[PDB]
Amino acid sequence: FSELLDLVGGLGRFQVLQTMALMVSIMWLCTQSMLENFSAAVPSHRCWAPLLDNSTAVSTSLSPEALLAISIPPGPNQRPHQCRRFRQPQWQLLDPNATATSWSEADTEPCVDGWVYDRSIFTSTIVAKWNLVCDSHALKPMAQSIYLAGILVGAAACGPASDRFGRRLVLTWSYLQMAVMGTAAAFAPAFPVYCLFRFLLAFAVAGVMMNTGTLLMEWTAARARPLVMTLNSLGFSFGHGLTAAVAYGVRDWTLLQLVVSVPFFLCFLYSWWLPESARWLIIKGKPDQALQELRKVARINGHKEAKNLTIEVLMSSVKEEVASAKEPRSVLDLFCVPGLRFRTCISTLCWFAFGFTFFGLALDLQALGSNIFLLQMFIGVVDIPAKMGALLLLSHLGRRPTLAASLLLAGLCILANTLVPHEMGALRSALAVLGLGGVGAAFTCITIYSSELFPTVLRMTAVGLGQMAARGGAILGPLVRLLGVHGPWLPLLVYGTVPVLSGLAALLLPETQSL
Template identity: 60%
Template sequence: MEFSELLEQAGGAGLFQTLLLLTFILPCFMISFHVLLENFSASVPGHRCWTQLLDNGSVVPANITPEALLTISIPPGPNWEPDQCRRFRQPQWQLVDPNATTSSWNEADTEPCVDGWVYDRSTFTSTIVMKWDLVCSSQGLKPLSQSIFMSGILVGSFIWGLLSHRLGRKPMLSWSCLQTAVAGTGTTFAPTLLIYCGLRFVTAFGIAGIFLSALGLMVEWTTTSRRAVTLTVLACSSSAGQAALGGVAFALRDWQTLQLAVSVPFFAIFLISWWLPESARWLIIKGKPDQALQELRKVARINGHKEAKNLTIEVLMSSMEEEVASAKEPQSGLDLFRVPMLRKRSCPALVTSFSLLISLYGLVFDLQSLGRDIFLLQVLFGAMDILGRATTVLLLSFLGRRTILAGFQVMAGLCILANTLVPPDLQTLRVVLAVLGKGCFGISLTCLTIYRAELFPTTVRKSTAAQGNRQEAVAVESTWF
């Protein structure tokens, strides 16, 4: 007898699994908010240099229009729009003359924005770009903050994978939720960019723990036959979070209010997490059969399965004898590459994950280049992702994993390549191609998540999930730099 048979006796597809799934929907929904938050909280608004004539009303000459003041104060930039990073040292009054030409001034007449910037606040009342002037010579700090966030997921994937294996899934899940809630809320009040990036790193560190622990508990309490549906539902909840983020950001135009709104719910998730049982499989492997038996009987009671009364410690230990012996052998993530069979699976899986994620995040983190209404774009991306991920379950019934994964990755790549050939002025066509590509990515990513869980044995599944998170973080950093 294997653990899957023990789980069947306790009820592998009953009320308990439904409650467990509903519990994990909320954290999966909220995680998307943090990952994509800087599409809005770090949005780059229109900006220009602060100038005495334009922005100090007491010195504005009479009978001079705002357009004329802009002409004599700010030099033209690309496409003859006002330059965003330079201003005239002195007002160029000669440019007011209708017959003035570009030869009426030169680069020597301009200087950087020494007195700061004036920002367009029609879309957002405040962003971190406005707060810390992450424009012009400091514009490289904006993508750096997102890369630091993804580095937190990278480091967290290493640490939480080890801790959840040694200390248990449930305590690590609860601690990760609390850490995310505290760090995310603290980010709202960050006085400097350095502290902001540090708190974002800690938040991402916690999010990695939530993902790994929740995935481990969900997989280990779900029978193999229902695993694909369960993982797809969780994936769809993540996509729903992407769509909801567009609406929340539309309602909350201040980055601090938005940051607070996406962080406080994790305090509730922390409290909810305490009802969850520990993984019975992990308890048996760690030599705690008494607790494992209690958890299995609790699940059986919730599911209404009376067969669990026949379960005893002797039955548990005899059925798990081989897996317990295997778990006592020295193991690490390097087993993915040392064992020939695992190496043959791991290398293609890692390459596929990286190519998929670097393209996906290059798309979803670049909303401003696709159109002006980034709120609508975010909602469309999330809605298409839900459709794509929900379709995966149907596709898996008719097509193989490899066919779906390869086919939809090719389709997503073609959408992105086609988008590069579309002129910037054809915004509608560019958005359509981007949304179709996002849907294809959703199908590919859901299929890959299910495929990985089926390809690798339980003893190394944590390593493969952590590898996926690391690939995600590295992919995002490669997108920025």
């Protein structure tokens, strides 16, 4: 096939502009996923209480600190209880002779009158709007799980639709669905409706993710294809910085969600000026359309050959593909072949670990460091050099040691985060950033390495199964935080154990760089 790209220009003005255009979309698409660090931030809260909040009642000369001690009991964390209040004001607790033994839990009641939230950092969040606290506290990670499950279902449905209707058409309606569903989520009236719209937004996120990469690869000559995949992967790196930059300015969740959604109307509008994949149009037996959209690109790249492209040349240049690209093999074949079964197991585990660890940690920055805006920005800034170093070492040291070393870097940093005491917040934050950097490097590493461990007929099958495994791991990511009742160390130990085991496992793979 690529002989045609050499008539049309296989790297040039069109591929440059297409890479820029799709990278920008991937940036905003990354903001959509990272948003719920900020849209769903948990502000500090307490029960509403008469002496503190009933401004219509008779006031007193006591200070707010004293009235808080008189109204809200202390909780386990040596801070005011987030889910209880005194049944009657505890005037007895003001005198210096008082002790903690002076009251008992029967003297307290739950927040009958609802909660009061700290508005200093964020003006509003979904947690503050729908009271996703105390007995409802599980509902935040449930919302994140529903989003990531939406992406799983969307990726499962994308394949058949992408193959039947085309890369660009599905990408176009994915952009429209992202805009519409993000705008709808921004104005949802109730929590179930918000979950429905976030699910339907994720369903389109999957389509954008898959089709952008597929279309970039299908329009790029082979010498530049790894570089193009790397640039498309740096799109997310800049997406992290963009998330921090936008969320630092917009402190209301409705306005923030709307702001990050609206750009996709423009993405929808400019996607119509992209060409549908020529490989797809030829494979589906539509030469008259493939010729048009090839010489359209030849016009952009500035070639005289737009006069030379002709149907007979177009047909003669792709004689093999239409005659042989007819093997949509089932996933089970990977397990049927004795040799490939165990390689498939290990590579699928390496895909799983990325999603599990990354969307375990990256979606609760509030636990990792002092300032989530700056920490998100750093998760971008450190992701970039990690990815470039991954590409280079992947090109020199071999895929096996680079995959193993990246995953072991991630695991060791995330585990060490549990050894460093809570007082050393700076080192905890730095280790968390480095761990997410290692995971993000392994993302590129595995994307390329899994495309070599299997014979060329089953290469694509392995990559698809790996992607589904990463999505299954991402879904479990958020739910693992529900173990945190037993301690803050436990979710971190789990998230750190997974990459350690998978990184050790990657050592058992064969090397695929030339030896």
